[PDB]
Structures are given as structure tokens and as C-alpha cells.
């Protein structure tokens, strides 16, 4: 379950997920988007090459449909590279 994409940085979030900070990006491909999660510099509008683990992260909504809230996980072998 490895992913690799290239696109423009559309949005940047500095957030929290249980006693740990996290930086997230909205990556605009071609036109679609996917969230990048990280547990010369990466800026707003940066055209970047991203590689990491693709998580589907399916959740139930309170029918009770089951939708996907997918994102790319990034850690030594995961990276976000400006280009």
C-alpha cells in the first residue's frame, strides 16, 4: 500500500491528534485533491513530490453509510519533496 504523487500545495494545517502535533497539506493533483499527513521549504503553492503510505481510513456516519476519508501517511522512507 505505497503511494507516490506530484501536485501543488493548496492548503496547510497545523493540528493535533492525541498528545502529538501534526502538519497536514492539501495536495492538488490533476483536478483532484488528497490530504498529506506528517506525524527551500514546503510552502503554500509549492509544487511537491510526495511519497508515503496511503490510508483509506473508512468511517461510519451516524442508513449509516461507510465513506472513505483517505490520506497519505508520511514518516525515514516517507517524504514530501519540493520540486
Amino acid at each position: 500500500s505505497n503511494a507516490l504523487m506530484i501536485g501543488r500545495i493548496a492548503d496547510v494545517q497545523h493540528g493535533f491528534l492525541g498528545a502529538m502535533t501534526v502538519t497536514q497539506y492539501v495536495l492538488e493533483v490533476d483536478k483532484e485533491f488528497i490530504v498529506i499527513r506528517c506525524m527551500d521549504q514546503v510552502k503554500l503553492g509549492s509544487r511537491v513530490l510526495v511519497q508515503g503510505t496511503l490510508r483509506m481510513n473508512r468511517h461510519v456516519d451516524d442508513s449509516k453509510r461507510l465513506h472513505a476519508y483517505p490520506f497519505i501517511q508520511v514518516v525515514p522512507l516517507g517524504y514530501v519533496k519540493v520540486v
Partner: nanobody
Amino acid sequence: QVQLQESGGGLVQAGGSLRLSCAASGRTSSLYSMGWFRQAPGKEREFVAAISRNGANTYYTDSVKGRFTISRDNAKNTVELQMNSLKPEDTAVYYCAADRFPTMEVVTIMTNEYDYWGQGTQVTVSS
């Protein structure tokens, strides 16, 4: 676009309690992280509390931990600030804010990242 309408504030004595309510209307579909901010005169907006879209994740400024509680009801498109054990320190104009960053579980803690703002509700605590 998006309106955030606030209520529940007012004047109370110290040790007293209030329940703030932020109601969202407009295109609530684009809203994800919700947060409460406050501003005392002279000083600038400080982060009080914020909550993820799924409600699973919350973050509090140190001074309000244990005293204030944040929850949300997405079906009603509302977020609440349960304020217990109010201190005079807590006197400020309280604002709710909404974030457009499309994420379900991650809570936004940076102020410049919140994209929509309420008009503000006055909270005064007398000692």
C-alpha cells in the same frame, strides 16, 4: 457564505457557569474543525478550545483545562462551550471559528488557519 451565530454569554459571578453555543448556517458542508477563541480588551485573541469534525479530538489552552468542555452536534450544526468554575481571568469577548481544511479527525490549533468567524459574544465574570 457561512454565518456563525453565537449565544449563551453574559454576566455571572465567579464560580458561576455558562453554556456558549455556536450555530452554523450557510454552506456547513465545507466546515471541519471548529474552535472557541477569546479576546480581552487591549490584548489579542487567544485560543480557548477546538474540536475535530468527528468530535473525537479536542484541544484546550492550559488555563481552561478541567473547567471548560467542548462538544459538537453535527446534525444540529452546533458546537458548545461548557464553562464551569468561571474566574475573573475568564472575562473576554468569546468568538467561535470554523476551518475549511478537509480533515475528519485532526483538530486545528493555529488561529490564522481558521477561515470563518462569529461576531462575538460578551462574557463577564465579577469577583
